[PDB]
Design a protein around this ligand. Structure first.
Ligand SMILES: O=C(NCc1c(F)cc(F)cc1F)c1cn2c(c(O)c1=O)C(=O)N1[C@H]3CC[C@H](C3)O[C@@H]1C2
Ligand SMILES: O=C(NCc1c(F)cc(F)cc1F)c1cn2c(c(O)c1=O)C(=O)N1[C@H]3CC[C@H](C3)O[C@@H]1C2
Ligand SMILES: [Mg+2]
Ligand SMILES: [Mg+2]
Ligand SMILES: [Zn+2]
Ligand SMILES: [Zn+2]
Ligand SMILES: [Zn+2]
Ligand SMILES: [Zn+2]
Lengths: 296, 258, 278, 278, 258, 296
DNA sequence: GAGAGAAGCGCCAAACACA
DNA sequence: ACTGTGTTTGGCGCTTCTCTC
DNA sequence: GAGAGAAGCGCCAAACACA
DNA sequence: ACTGTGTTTGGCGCTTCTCTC
C-alpha cells in the first residue's frame, strides 16, 4: 500500500486499519519452507513499520482500533498447538510471531491505552485462549507470553480472581490429571511477582492456595527444571506473616524423599532459605522433629 | 560477516544464527572450521562461586581468578602472576565492578579466602562468605576458548585473548535451554510487584519546553510530552510527524496545561 | 557626516545618532565597517552539540587521562557510551597502540560492541595497528577537529568525575592500591550513582530493553553558503581573519578555505558573521 | 546502612536513598562528609563588587598595560574615575616610580584631584617616592589582595577598550604616530562614546553638577563568624584547605588564618562554606 | 591644608578662600610667601587661539604649544624639543582630547599651520582655520607659574611642573569677574531651549528590579524608581529611609505598574 | 530639634515644617561679623540637612508644604538691596544665601513637584520681587538667580507673556530712564535660551521685541561687558526666518560709531557672524550700502 | 480547640574543571 | 562527517508537621 | 477603499578579554 | 579596609509604513 507516515492525518487512521488488516492473512513455514516469499517479506516490513509507528506518536489509539488489532493477534497466535515431540525444537514461523508479540506488547503498554475500553473487548475467553498457549515448547514464546500476561494481569482489575481460579485449576490438572507441561517456570515467576504485592493481613484463600497447589507440587518428579522459581515463591510469601510457616514445615518434612537419591540436595536448598528466616521470632516449635527427620 | 566473526571469535553456531547467517550456513561454517570440528542461586547476584585455576603455557604459568554467578553463568575472570589474599580482593572488586555486589559468596578453602584480610574486605561490603571443601564447566569452556585463540595466533599479550574470551562467553554465546545469552539472562529486568486492590497506574513523565539546536533562538516553543529520556538527551516530537533528540541544556521542566 | 566621523574615530552607534543619522543608517555603517568587525572579539553564533547515539552501544567516546599516585604517572584509558553514559576505564603504564587496543577490547568485554567510535587526533588513535583492530571488528573510527577539545566534552567530563572519585578515595586511605580504587569507583559510577536529570543510573539505561527501534534520520542540510570571519583552532589570534566564503557548511561546523591551496573545518565557536561583498 | 556505604564508596544522595534513608538524613551525611567537600570544586558564595565613589573625583583606579607597536613595547599608565568612567592615559617607555608619579599628575591635570585611589600590588605602586607623592597631595593610596586581578575589573576592562580602539586605528594607518592615536582614542572614549546603560558619555557625568550631596554611610558589619574552606589566591590547588575559623569577615572578603603565625585576606570567590565542628 | 597647598601650588588667595582658610588667613598666607610677595568667542570650544612660545632654561630651550579658548580662558599646553608641522598636529590632537573639538581655530602665520599637512589634519576634523598676522596673558601667567615652580625646586623633569601648572590654572585658580574657575566656566552645562506653547514636562526615569549585593539571593524585589544613575551603578532606595548604589549587573529594567 | 530622618513617617512632615520654620529667623553679617555664632551654625547645619533630605526621597512634597518654603525663601532673599558702590564686593551672608538658593533649586526641580499647586501660590508679584533682585552685584547670586528663573519660566505656562512684558519694560527703563544695571549678561542668556525654542512662522511681537529692545540696545556705552551673549541672541533668532535680516542690517549700519574708537572691533565680530549666515539665499540687497559704510 | 512556627522535601541557576 | 557536558550547591516555594494561648 | 507585507527601532542575554 | 566589569551582537516584540485585489 503506502507508508503510514506519508498520509494526511484525516485518513491516517484509515490506512492504519488497512495496513493492520494486511497481516491478517496467514503464512505457514511448516507446510513448506519456500512459499510466498515476497508476501512474507512485505508482511515483515509492514509489521516493523507498525511497531515503529506505534511507539513514536500520541493520541493514536481510537475506539475502532481496539478490536481489530486484538483480532489480528487472535488470528495469528491463538491456534492449534504443534504436536508434542518431547535441545528443544524452535517454532518455524518465529520472525512473524516475534514481531506480532512485540507489537502487542507495545499496544498494551502505550500511555494512550485506556483500561476501560477493552473491558468489553477483552473477556475471560481471551484469557483462557492465551493461557492455553503457555504449553508451547518454544522458550522465547514462553518469555514473551509471560511478559505479556504480567501486564494484562496488572492493568485490569476485574480479571484477577478469574485468573487465580484458572491457575488453580490448571495446577490441579497438571498435578493430578496430566503430567505433561512445559511452562511451569514462567507461571511461577508471574505468581511470585503477584505474591510480592500482597498486603496485611493475609487472606484465607491465599492460605488455601499455598496448602493445595504450592506445597504438594513438590512431589513432581521433574522438579529440577523449575526448582529456583518455585522456591522463590515460598521465600516471597512467608515474610508477610511468619505464623503460617509451621504447616509449610510439616509439608516439607512429609514430602522429603525417604530414600537416597540425587534429588535431596535441592530440598536442602529450600530448607536453607527457610532456615535463614525461621531463626528469629523464636520458632523452635518444630525444630526437634525437623532435626530428627534430617538426621536420617 | 559471520565467517570473519567465527574466525576471530570462534563462537557457537547459534550465535551465528542470530546474525545474518541462517541455520544451514551456520552449520556449514561450524563444520568447516578445522579447530571447531543445576542452579543453586535464585536471583542474579545472589550467590557466587569463586575458583582459582592454573593456566599452563609453554614456558610460564598464569593464575585465573574466576567468579561465576550461580543463576546465569556470568563469568568474571582476572589474570595474575602470583596468588595471595590481596589479589583475591582485587579480583573480587573487579568482579563487583563488572557484575555488581552479591549478597552471598561461596568458595573453596585455601591460603586465600581464609585470612583476616579477605574477611575484612567482605565485611565492609556486607557480603557473607561461606567455605566448603569437596561451576567447573565454565572454567573448562574458558580454557578451551583460550587454547583456540592461542592456536589461531601465538603472538597475544595474554590480555587481549582473555578480554575477547570473556566477551564471547558473556555477550555472544547463547544458552541452549532459555535461548538467552549469559549477559541477557543475568541483566534481564525482573518483574515489578503487583499491588493488590489497587490498579497499576501508568507512569506519567513530565512535560518540557524545548529549543531547536542550531538556530540560536531565545524562545521556548510549547510545553510538550517527552517520549523517551536518556543520558544527555531526550526524545521530543517537534511536530506531529517526526521526533528529535534534544540535549538537556535546551530543555526546561514544565507543568501540565490542564 | 556620520560616514567621515566613523571613518576617522570609529565611534559607536548613538555617537553617530546625535550628529544626525537614523538608527538603521548608523547600524548599516557599523555592520558595513571592515576594521570595526575584525577587531571586536564579540560574536553570536549557534552552539554545537556532540553526536549522540540512537540506542545503547551505538556511539562511544574515548580519551586518555593522566593520574599521579605514589610518585607514578598512570595513564587511564576511558571509554564512555554516548547513549547511557556507561564508563569503562583501564589503567596502564604508558601510551601505545597496543595499550589502546587492549583498552578497547576490555571495554567491549565490559559493555558491548559499538558501531561508531570517535576520539580526538591523539598520537595513538591514528596508527596502523589501531585502524586494523577497528576494521577487524567492523567498527568505524572517526576523528575530531584538531586542537578542539570541546568536541569531546562528554569523555573529558567523565575523566573529571573519575579523577574526583579517585582523589576522594585516596584522601582517606593513601595506601589503597590503584586497581582497588579504580574498581570501586567504576562500580560506584556505573551501578550506584544516578544521573542528575533522568534520575536513572547508567546501568539501567545500558541494559534497558532494546525494544525501541532506531528513529529514521534525514541527511538533508542547508543548500546555501555565507561569508565568515574565521580563526584557526590551533592558534589563538586577537583579530578575525578573512572574510572568506565557505565551500559547504554542516550542523556544528563549516568548511572554510584557509588558503588558496587547501581548505579546513572550523567549528561554529570560532566563526563570525560577515557582510555580503556583492 | 547508608553511613558505611558512603564511607566506603562516597556515592551520591539518591544512591543512599534507594538503600533506605530519608532525604534529610542523606543530605546530612553528604554535608557532614569531610573528604566529599574538599575534593568537590563546586561552591556557591556571594559575589563581590569593587568599591565605587559617591561623587566625581572620589575614587580612582589605575593600572599599567603593555602595547606593541613598531617593534617597541610602550607602557600605558591608565587611570579611570570610578563614578563616571573617565579615562586618563599616558604612554611611557619604561616602568618606574617617576613614570607613575608623572602619569598621576597628568591625570590630575586632566580630570581633577581624587581623594582615594586603589591599584594592585605592582612593583611601582609600593615605592617610597609614590607614597610621598600621594601624601603630599593628601591622597590615600590603598592596595588590593595580591594575585587577584578581579578586584580591579574596571581598570583592566578600560585597558581592553583602549587597546581595542588603538588596534582599530592602527589597522587602517600603520604609519600613524602613537601619540596621535592615543589622543584620538582618548577623545573618542571620553567625549564621543556613550555608556551602554545610562546612555550618557563619561564626560557629561564627570562635569554634571556636583549639587547632589554625599549619602551617609554605615560602617556596621556582621558580628558573627563562620568556618570556611580556603584557597590561596596566589597558587591554584585542586582541593580545598582547612577548614578554619575567620577572625573577622567584611563585605567581599574574609580574614582567614593561613597558618598559626599570621593571617591573610581571602576573597569570597575562593571560600567554601563548612560544617560547624561543634 | 591651605599652607602646604600654596607651598606646592602657589595658587591665588581666592582659591585658598574656597578652601578651609578664610579671607584673613588667605591674605596672611599670600603676603607671607617670599615668592608670591575681551572675549571674541561666543561659546566654549567655538574659537581658539594657538600660540608657540620659547621657554628659556639655564642650558636648553623648550617649545610650548599652547591652545587657549577665547570664551573661558582654558589652556592646553604641550612641551616639545623641536617645532615642525607634525608636532603642531600632535599638540592640536592633545588639546582636542583635553578640551574637545572646536568649530573655529585661529593662529598666527609661520612655518607651522601653513603647510598642507596641517590643513589636511584640520579638514578631516571639520575645523576651519584662519590666519592673521599682527591671548598673550595666559602665556605670561603660565611662564610665571613655571618659574615659581622651578624656583621652589630645580630637580623637576619639566613634565611634572607643566602638569601641575595646567592643573593650577584650570582647576584651582578662580576668575575675578565671574567667580568661576576656568574649568568650571568652560564646562558649565548650557541652558536647554524652551519650546513654545508646550509645557516643559519633567523627564521620567525607568523603574528597576534590584537585588541586594552580598546576599546570594535569586529574587528581584519590587519594581522601584531610581533616584540617580552613574557609570556601573545606580541609586535605589532599598527602604523608605535609606538608598544604596546598586551595580548594573544586579538591576533589570521594568515597566510602571500603573 | 531632631534629625528629620529619625522620626516616624506619621509626623515626619510635621518636623519637616518645624525645621523649615527654624531658618525663618534672620542673621545679618553686615551689622557685625560676630553675632549669634552657634545660631548661625545650627541654621547652616539645618539647611544642609534639608537640602540632603529633599533629594533622597519621593512623595515628600504635600499640599501644606508649598506655601511656607516659598515664604521662607520670601523671608530671606527678597529684601532691600545693598547700597550701590560701583573687583566687585562679595555679599556678606553668602553661605546661608547659597544654601537657600540650592534648596529652592532642588525644591522646584523635584519630580514630585506639581505645576498646578503653585499656580495660586506663585503669582506675578513673586516674579516682580524676584526680577528686582537681579540688580545684585554678587556674580554668584546672579548665576543662581538666572538658573532659577530659567526653570521658573519653563515650568509655568501662564507666567510667560507677563515676564516678556516685564523684561521689555525693564529694558526700556535701562535704555532710557536709568543706565545703572549689572545683570544684563544673565538675562540675555535666558532670553537666548527662550529664543532657541521658537517655532514657525515667527510672530509679530517677536519682530517688535527685536526692533525695539534688541537692536537699539547696542547704543549702550558699556556694551563690552556683555558683548558675546547679546550677539548670540541675534545669532539665535535669524535662523528661524532669513527674510527679517535686512532691518537688522540697517540698524547695525546706523548704530555704527562714525568716529575712531576701540569699540569698533566688537561690532565687526557681530557682523562677521551675520556675514557667515547672510551669504546664502542671495542676500545682496543691502550688500553695497554695507560695503560703502564699512569702507569709511 | 484552633492557627501560627517548625521540620521535611523537590527543584534550579550560576560555577568549575576536564592537559 | 563536522559540533561542550554532567555534577555540586545553597536559596526558595510548596507542604505537612506540632507546641502554645 | 481597506487589510496584509515591509522597513524602522528599542531592547537583551550569552560571549570575550582585560598579562 | 577587604570585593569583577563594560562593550558587542543577532534575534525578537512592538510599531508605523505602503503596494495590491
Ligand atoms: O584541553 C584539553 N582538556 C581541557 C578542556 C576540556 F577537557 C574540555 C573543554 F571544553 C575545554 C578544555 F580546555 C585537552 C587537550 N588535549 C587532548 C585532550 O583529549 C584534551 O581534553 C588530547 O588528547 N591531545 C592529543 C592530540 C594532540 C595532543 C594530544 O594534544 C591534545 C591535547
Ligand atoms: O591577570 C591579569 N589580567 C587578566 C585578568 C583581568 F584583567 C581581569 C580578570 F577578572 C581576570 C584576569 F585574568 C593581571 C595580572 N597582573 C597585574 C594586573 O594588573 C592584571 O590585570 C599586575 O599588575 N601585576 C603586578 C603585581 C605582581 C605582578 C605585577 O603581577 C601581577 C600581574
Ligand atoms: Mg581530553
Ligand atoms: Mg591589570
Ligand atoms: Zn572456528
Ligand atoms: Zn569603522
Ligand atoms: Zn563521603
Ligand atoms: Zn607662594
Amino acid at each position: 500500500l503506502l507508508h503510514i507516515r506519508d498520509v494526511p492525518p484525516a485518513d491516517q487512521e484509515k490506512l492504519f486499519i488497512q495496513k493492520l488488516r494486511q497481516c491478517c492473512v496467514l503464512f505457514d513455514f511448516v507446510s513448506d519452507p519456500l512459499s510466498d516469499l515476497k508476501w512474507k517479506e512485505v508482511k515483515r516490513a509492514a509489521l516493523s513499520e507498525m511497531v515503529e509507528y506505534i511507539t513514536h506518536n500520541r493520541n493514536v489509539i481510537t475506539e475502532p482500533i481496539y478490536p481489530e488489532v486484538v483480532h489480528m493477534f487472535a488470528v495469528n497466535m491463538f491456534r492449534t498447538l504443534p504436536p508434542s515431540s518431547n535441545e528443544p525444537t524452535l517454532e518455524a514461523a518465529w520472525p512473524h510471531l516475534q514481531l506480532v508479540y512485540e507489537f502487542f506488547l507495545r499496544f498494551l503498554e502505550s500511555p494512550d491505552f485506556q483500561p476501560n475500553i477493552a473491558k468489553k473487548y477483552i473477556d475471560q475467553k481471551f484469557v483462557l485462549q492465551l493461557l492455553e498457549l503457555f504449553d508451547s515448547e518454544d522458550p522465547r514464546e514462553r518469555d514473551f507470553l509471560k511478559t505479556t500476561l504480567h501486564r494484562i494481569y496488572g492493568k485490569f482489575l476485574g480479571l484477577r480472581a478469574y485468573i487465580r481460579k484458572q491457575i488453580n485449576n490448571i495446577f490441579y490438572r497438571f498435578i493430578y490429571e496430566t503430567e505433561h507441561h512445559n511452562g511451569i517456570a514462567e507461571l511461577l515467576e508471574i505468581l511470585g511477582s503477584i505474591i510480592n504485592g500482597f498486603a496485611l493481613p493475609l487472606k484465607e484463600e491465599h492460605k488455601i492456595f499455598l496448602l493445595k497447589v504450592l506445597l504438594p507440587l513438590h512431589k513432581v518428579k521433574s522438579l529440577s527444571v523449575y526448582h529456583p522459581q518455585l522456591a522463590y515463591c515460598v521465600v516471597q510469601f512467608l515474610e508477610k506473616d511468619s505464623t503460617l510457616t509451621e504447616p509449610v514445615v510439616m509439608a516439607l518434612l512429609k514430602y522429603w524423599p525417604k530414600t537416597h537419591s540425587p534429588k535431596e540436595v535441592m530440598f536442602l536448598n529450600e530448607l536453607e532459605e527457610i532456615l535463614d528466616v525461621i531463626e528469629p521470632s523464636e520458632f523452635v516449635k518444630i525444630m526437634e522433629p525437623l532435626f530428627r527427620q534430617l538426621a536420617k | 560477516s559471520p565467517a570473519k566473526l567465527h574466525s576471530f571469535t570462534h563462537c557457537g553456531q547459534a550465535a551465528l544464527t542470530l546474525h545474518g547467517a541462517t541455520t544451514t550456513e551456520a552449520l556449514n561454517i561450524l563444520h568447516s572450521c578445522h579447530a571447531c570440528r543445576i542452579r543453586r542461586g535464585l536471583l542474579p547476584n545472589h550467590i557466587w562461586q569463586g575458583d582459582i585455576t592454573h593456566f599452563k603455557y609453554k614456558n610460564t604459568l598464569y593464575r585465573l581468578h574466576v567468579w561465576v554467578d550461580t543463576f546465569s553463568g556470568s563469568v568474571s575472570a582476572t589474570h595474575k602472576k602470583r596468588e595471595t589474599s590481596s589479589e583475591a580482593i582485587s579480583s573480587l572488586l573487579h568482579a563487583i565492578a563488572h557484575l555488581g555486589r552479591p549478597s552471598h559468596i561461596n568458595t573453596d578453602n585455601g591460603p586465600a579466602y581464609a585470612s583476616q584480610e579477605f574477611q575484612h574486605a567482605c565485611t565492609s561490603l556486607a557480603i557473607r562468605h561461606t567455605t566448603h571443601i569437596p561451576v567447573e564447566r565454565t572454567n573448562g569452556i574458558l580454557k578451551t576458548l583460550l587454547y583456540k585463540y592461542f592456536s589461531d595466533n601465538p603472538n597475544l599479550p595474554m590480555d587481549n585473548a582473555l578480554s575477547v574470551a570473556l566477551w564471547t562467553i558473556n555477550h555472544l554465546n547463547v544458552l541452549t535451554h532459555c535461548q538467552k545469552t549469559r549477559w541477557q539472562l543475568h541483566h534481564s529486568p525482573r518483574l515489578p510487584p503487583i499491588p493488590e486492590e489497587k490498579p497499576v497506574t501508568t507512569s506519567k513523565t513530565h512535560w518540557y519546553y524545548f529549543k531547536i539546536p542550531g538556530l540560536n533562538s531565545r524562545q521556548w516553543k510549547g510545553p510538550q510530552r517527552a517520549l523517551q529520556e536518556a543520558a544527555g538527551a531526550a526524545l521530543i516530537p517537534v511536530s506531529d510527524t517526526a521526533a528529535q533528540w534534544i540535549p538537556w541544556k535546551l530543555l526546561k521542566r514544565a507543568v501540565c496545561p490542564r
